[PDB]
Every structure is written in C-alpha cells, then in structure tokens.
Amino acid sequence: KFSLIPKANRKAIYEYLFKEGVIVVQKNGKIERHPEVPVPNLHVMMTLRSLQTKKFVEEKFNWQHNYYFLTNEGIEFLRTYLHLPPTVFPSTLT
Amino acid sequence: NTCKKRKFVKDGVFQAELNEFLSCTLSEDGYSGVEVRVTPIRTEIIIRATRTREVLGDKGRRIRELTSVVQKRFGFAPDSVELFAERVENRGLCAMAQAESLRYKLLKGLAVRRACYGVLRHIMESGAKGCEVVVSGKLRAQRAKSMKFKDGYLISTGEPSKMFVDQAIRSVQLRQGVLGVRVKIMLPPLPDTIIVMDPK
Amino acid sequence: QRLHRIRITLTSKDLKSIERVCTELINGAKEKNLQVAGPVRLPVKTLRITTRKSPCGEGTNTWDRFELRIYKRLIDLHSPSDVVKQITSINIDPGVEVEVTII
Amino acid sequence: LFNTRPKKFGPGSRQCRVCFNRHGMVRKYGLMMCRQCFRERANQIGFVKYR
RNA sequence: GACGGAAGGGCACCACCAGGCGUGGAGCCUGCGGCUUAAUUUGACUCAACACGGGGAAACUCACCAGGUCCAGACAUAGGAAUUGACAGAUUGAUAGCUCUUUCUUGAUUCUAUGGGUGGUGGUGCAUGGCCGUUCUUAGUUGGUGGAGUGAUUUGUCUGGUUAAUUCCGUUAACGAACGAGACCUUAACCUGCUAAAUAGGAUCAGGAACUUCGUGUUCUUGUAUCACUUCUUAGAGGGACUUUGCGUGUCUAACGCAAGGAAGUUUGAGGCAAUAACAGGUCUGUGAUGCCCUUAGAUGUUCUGGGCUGCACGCGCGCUACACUGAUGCAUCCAACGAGUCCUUGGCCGAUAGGUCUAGGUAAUCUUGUGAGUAUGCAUCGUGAUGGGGAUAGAUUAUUGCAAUUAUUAAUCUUCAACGAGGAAUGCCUAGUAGGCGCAAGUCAGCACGUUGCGCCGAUUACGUCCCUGCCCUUUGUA
C-alpha cells in the first residue's frame, strides 16, 4: 500500500525468490499485491527497484509486467541474508 | 466458461503477448519464431531457434526459467506449461533472425555499408530466391537518408506476397538517434509460373 | 458397457486444420466400426473489427476491415465413453480446441 | 483519504495493456487494445483483413 | 526535368455533357476561426485543415486554471541516531494529523547533504524510427552486357494498329531479364447433381381442436412419434464462360462491335493487396520507438476537491428536420438482412407514460428472436389557411444512469406555436439493385447519435459519348 515495507515482509519477497528463482511484478502502482505473495504491489516494485540497481537480479521489461531472472551472484546475496544452506537451490536441478 | 468468439480472442492475444516477450529475452540468442499445441491439461509450447545452446544454457537453466515465467503471469498450474527448444532446418530464410543479427553489428559499431552486405550475402548463399535490406534514419549526416540494398527478385503485391515473402522490422539505438532496419526475404506452387512437360 | 450417444464439438481458426480432423477421426471410428454420422457443418461466425488506418486524424479517413473466422463442426456417434478415449487422445492437432460431450 | 476516487466506469477506469493509453480503446470481444497498438499486432492475434 | 493561353495522341461523373438529388437561404446539431476569460489545454489550414486526432469531454479522462497532498528521489559517500500512525479541539471545503496549543506512539524501512538517477499529454516531427495520407487509381520504374556521345545523358522503354494496362501482335542497335500491371485472395450470382444435419427443416404416418359435417372437405396444432428424405436452410467437395457459336470489322496478326444461346458475356459484379522516386505533408499528445534540451520537491512527476474544454457583437465547413394534399393525423393489414450478449431480455402482475417488481431461458443455428423495422398497403377525418404543414424557443411536473446531473446526460406528460412558401452569387455527389428515400444493427458507452462503419427494404430519370471547363499520362516542340 503506502510507506516502507516491514523488514519481515522484505524477507517475504526474498524467500519467495530464494525458493523459485522467478518473481514478476506488474508495473502499476495502484494494482493489488501481485498474485502469489501476500504483500502490497508497490512494495514489490520498490524492493526490486532497490535490487536491480545493486545488480544481483537481471531485470527484463515487456508488457508492464517486469520478468526478473536471478543470476549466480544474486543467489550468493540472498543466501547470506537468508542464511540458507550453501548450494541449497541449483537452477540446474529440476 | 467463456463463449467461443471470446475464447479465440483470449487464446489469440495470449499468442501475441507471448511472442513479443520471447523476441526481447531471446534477442542476442536470435530466435526464429514460436508455436503452441494445446492438449487437455497439458499445454505444450514449442520454441523454434537458430541455435539451441543459449536457450537451454546449462542443464536447462533458461528453459526452466521460461516454464516458470509463463505460469507465474497467466495463472497456470505448475508443470502444465512446459517448453521445448527446436532447430529450424535451412536457418537463413527467417527474416526476424537477420534483422536481429544486423542489429548487433550496428550496435557494436561497424560501418553500415560493410555489415548489410554480409547479412545480404548469408541469405543469398542459404538458398533464398531473393531479398532486400533497408536502413532508414540518419547516417553520416544530420538530415535523414535511407540507404537501400537489394539482390534477387522480390514481389510486393497480392495474397502471394504474404506467403512467399517473410518480412521483419526492428529498432536500433545510436549516439545521435534511432536507425530503422527492414529485412524482406523471398522464399522458394506459384500463381504466375507454368512448368509444361515434354512428351517424348 | 451401455448404449450411449456422443456428439463431439470441433472449433478452430483454420479450415485446413479441421479437415485433417474430420477425415482422420471418422476413419479412426471405422477401425472399430461405430455408428458414425457425417460432420455437421454449422454456419460460420465471422468476427469483425474496423479501425482507422492512421494514428492521427490527417489525410483521408481510411479504414481497415479485419476479420476472424470460426468453424463449428460436429462429429456424431452412438457408442460408450471408454471406446472414444483411444480415438481422440491420439491425433491431437496444433491450435484446435476440441471438447467431447455425451448427449 | 488520498490517491483514490471511485474509479469504476468511464475512460478513466481502464487503459491499454500494451501501451497504457485510454484513447481509441477497442473493447469488442474483450480485447482492451488501444487502436495504434491493435492494428500492427492484428495479424499475430488472428485477424487477417480481406474485402 | 518542370512549365506553355504550341502541336499530335489517348484517358476520369474526385471533369464537363444529358440528367437525377443536393448544399449555399431558414432554424437546430456539431467542427474551425476570432471576440471573451482566473482557465476557456492543443494539434491540422486549397484538393491532401474544418461529425478529423476513432475528440458523443458532468468528475475520471486532462494536457488548462485557483487551491491542497504524497515522494511512489534507485544507489554511492557522509553526518545524525532517525522517520511514521492519530483521537477531541485549533485551522482548513475536507472524518487530508497537512500544519498545529499540547502528549502518547513508530522502531532503523528512512531522514540530512553532496553527486547521480527517475518521470512527464513539458519543447522540437526542420534531429529521427514506425505508421498513415498525398503525388497516383494512373501505368509506370530499374539495372546486366552491347551500340551512340569528349560528357551530362541516351538507346532498350519504339513509327503504327490493339488494350482497363510498358497488354499484346509487330517494327528494330539492340538482346535477355526484374518489380508494377495481369495472375492471385475474399465475397455475390446458377446447379431438383455430389456429401450430410434432434443446435436448419420438409414430407410422411397416427392423434387433438374448430368450422363443415362434402368424404381424407379447407385451416391451425402435436410428439428421440416414427419409417425414410435434402427442393428451400447450412457448407465442405466441385462443375460453370473460353468472349464458345453466327455475321460484320483488321497487314483479317493482336483484337473490337452486334445478334442468338445462357444463371452469368464491361476482366461476370464489388473490394482487399499495391512498385520506383519522393514531399523539409502529419503524428515526440498511440507506445518501455528515441537523440538533444527543459525541469525534478516552493514540480511541468503524481493525485484529491471544485471549475473549464459547452463560455458569444459576428464570419466559414460536414450533417439533421422542414416548407405540405404523391401529404399530415387516427385506426387496421402484413414483410427484411448485418450484428451483438456472463450482460441480452422473453413470461406474469402494477402503471396514461416512462419504468418498476416477481419468476425465467441463454456461453448462444438451441435463449432473447422467425428481433412481427419503416418508406408501403386498406379504411376514415382534415381542406390550402403558414393550417391540424413546421416543432425551434420557454415554464411546470414524473421516472432512469451515477458516488454527484446546476451551464439543465437522457426518456416521458401537459402546455408555450417563432423562422421557413423550394432557397442569391458560387459549387458537391453519382451510370443499375447504382442515385435518392426509408429504417435496423454494431463502434465509442455507467448514461447520451442529429456522427461514422456495415446491413437490408421501396426502387426511378438520363448517357453508353467527349476533350469545352477542371486535372491526368505519353510523344515532338520552345525556354532567359
């Protein structure tokens, strides 16, 4: 909705991205939180505006919908913040 | 449910929204086209390509991205959509390949004369009947001046245009502005020609 | 098994896609020799949009006349549902919406 | 409180998915396509013009 | 090359001819000048600006104007250890804690400053892409080798006949090719043939009602009632026109005209598609197509309340309804096709009307719907009076959409009863299911069509030629 996203709900974005490795957000600000993760839709746009400008995630637009991919240096960052076991989620694994 | 006229619209726009996305992600990959084969509760989706190395990447990295990326957006079940890469035989004839090839030659920084002949040479060698390659926009000048390149015959008109040609257009971005780039490629049962037999 | 009645809908954009299916599935029925009636060709629902060609107002006010075409066609049968699942599941076509229905 | 009127109906409610433009919105069969956007992608959807 | 109020050819109802129906006149709707205003956002100005930007604007849209918010300013470096939610009064249109007189809370998301991003319907279409219009609905346009010329260039691409056509036969320093044209694609016309249809019907065979009882005598109605059928209905496969045949017309070569036959003989009718060159055409306001510039928190970002685009001494452009008696009005009769719906609306009650209320079918060849459309037809009253033709202008009331209808969104009911008596000079559109008239449906749409795009119905007059006007194409010719 409005204001800074809680720091628990920061990790709600990251732990979804930690498991699955994709996260697509509709461009619209007033739109409802993205289907999937129960948060505000602005907060998903803000946290991945924050993410792309320090590299890690690979942003790709088309169609208002912003189709992110997560790189090799990206999965290092989340694991450190996440504390997930190393080698926890290979994209080579099915 | 929805009605059949609305269903072909909803399924039809899904093709268009899919295709322009898979143009932009597979730009440096340099793809040919797309197709879909719906079956009951297993919606298959066939990506054609010039090269298969980038699209699978490493043990199906960028396949298993694009399986996930579709089903997040349009609201499918997990493992319902599923992508298969494919090689096109006779790969030169596709027009959207060559426009995307000619993009990265200009975008890296070659002269416009040298690059466009090289793209025109490949499609002529590959066994297209004829072709052209236009490059609009400003070039060695402040006023715009569209250079044109052409070899082999190329029809413009009729319903036989749409089948026997294949035609494509892209942007490409420079320091001073945007260039255009057209490609148009005539392929190999025509209307006009009549091949008469010998009796003996 | 029991005496049933099945009437399978077929719809697509192309003519050529359905004329594969109509020829194939009747011959697929005539493997087992079920009570086939021929494919009942319904009227064609032509969809239509007319937009202006130009983005802005300038020039003469010219118009596109875009069209889709949709082809409802109906293969009739009298046979139980366990028999028909072999016929339909093999030979599925690219971009042809098909739905089997009892009665 | 702020940042929302009732936005339910009229041209202000809805926009072009491809280009975000309300004007020239083709809503026949539920397209939701702005006309500049719609004509160039019409062949890829299915629509082929004749007569 | 272009131009000529020079010649010789061939063409178009965006040009005349012969005409048909109009506009220009009247009021009204709607667009553009101006004039006005806090603001009346702004593009485009001969054809090719002006019911055009799918532009029918109550708010939204919105660019404009008077005010009020939020940062939705990534990240880098750095100080500080920070920023938020808000009651009841104050203050404010405001139940925006915006800011406050006060005092509870928030817990490192952000604040503070410097660099730098970010965003825009800000400016530039004379920096561009893409798209469309126009030159141009016409028949035109290139290079390869060879010939001519010191060269620009030329020849091919042509005296002549023929064609809707650089389309053909032919003539030849040209020969052989490519695009355009043609072919092609879609649709409309005719098949007692082909292949079928409880989501189209017909005919049957048995039953029901009514009149007749004349008798299987006419007209309605009935059913997974049937046996079996495809003429209409629907649509896959196809057939069908080649100017075939006859007589003229021509180096009788290319091909024209006329008559007969035929569903159809202008390429059978009507469209889509559309070359090379371009034009400082239009569009930065269709865009995540974009260079550069502007500005970026006391904002041109964004969004909320209210107004405006509709404001009127007066010019100009597309349309609608009119002036009546081939008519208006009141009753009765009975006929279309294109659509379109998760909203379209039958059925029964209430109500002069609008409309409402309670059930009800429909993801649609099944339901609305066979959409009982209106010019039309039949029977009455009116009587040439601006009259009952005309329905502007204006008061008062009842419903409907919406969160909100005042500058009145419409629809009704009663009144109010103007101009206009066939339109001055100028000038548009059009050759057969065409003109004109009469409705219907869809697009934009919560609501609103006097607008556009398609659809049928009733259905004429007059040409079948021409280069006089207005343009066009090709030669020879003149040019400062």
Annotation: CATH topology of C1-103: Alpha-Beta Plaits (3.30.70)
Cα D20-D25-D29 angle, rounded to 5 deg: 115
CATH code (residue A30): 1.10.10.10
The answer to whether B142 and B119 have CB atoms below 8 angstroms apart is no
Residue B186 — φ and ψ, nearest 5°? -70, 135
Domain boundaries defined on chain C: 1-103
Number of domains in chain A: 1
- Domains detected in chain D: 1-51 (4.10.830.10)
Domains of chain B, each with CATH number or no CATH = 1-89 (3.30.300.20), 90-200 (3.30.1140.32)
Tokens 């204001």 correspond to A3
Kindly list the residues of chain B whose beta carbon comes within 8 Å of any beta carbon in chain C: 4-5, 7-9, 11-12, 35-39
The angstrom resolution of this structure is 3.3
Residue to test with chain C: of D19, D28, D39, most C Cβ within 10 A = D39
Determine the angle formed by the axes of helices B61-73 and B4-25, rounding to 10 degrees.
140
Domain region containing A80: 1-94
- CA pair distance A89, C21, nearest whole angstrom: 45
To probe the interface with A, which of B68, B76, B83 has the most A CB atoms within 10 Å?
Answer: B68
Secondary structure class of B102 (helix, strand, coil): helix
Residue B197 DSSP code: P
Under 8 Å between Cβ of B36 and B43: yes
- Report angle CA B10, B12, B14 to the nearest 5 degrees: 70
Give the chain B residue whose CA is nearest to the CA of C93.
B37
Do residues B128 and B152 touch, judged by C-beta distance below 8 A?
yes
Which tokens hold the place of B85? 């890469």
Dmax over Cα atoms in chain C, in whole Å? 70
Go through chain C and tell me how many residues it has.
Answer: 103
The answer to whether the beta carbons of residues C76 and C7 sit under 8 Å apart is yes
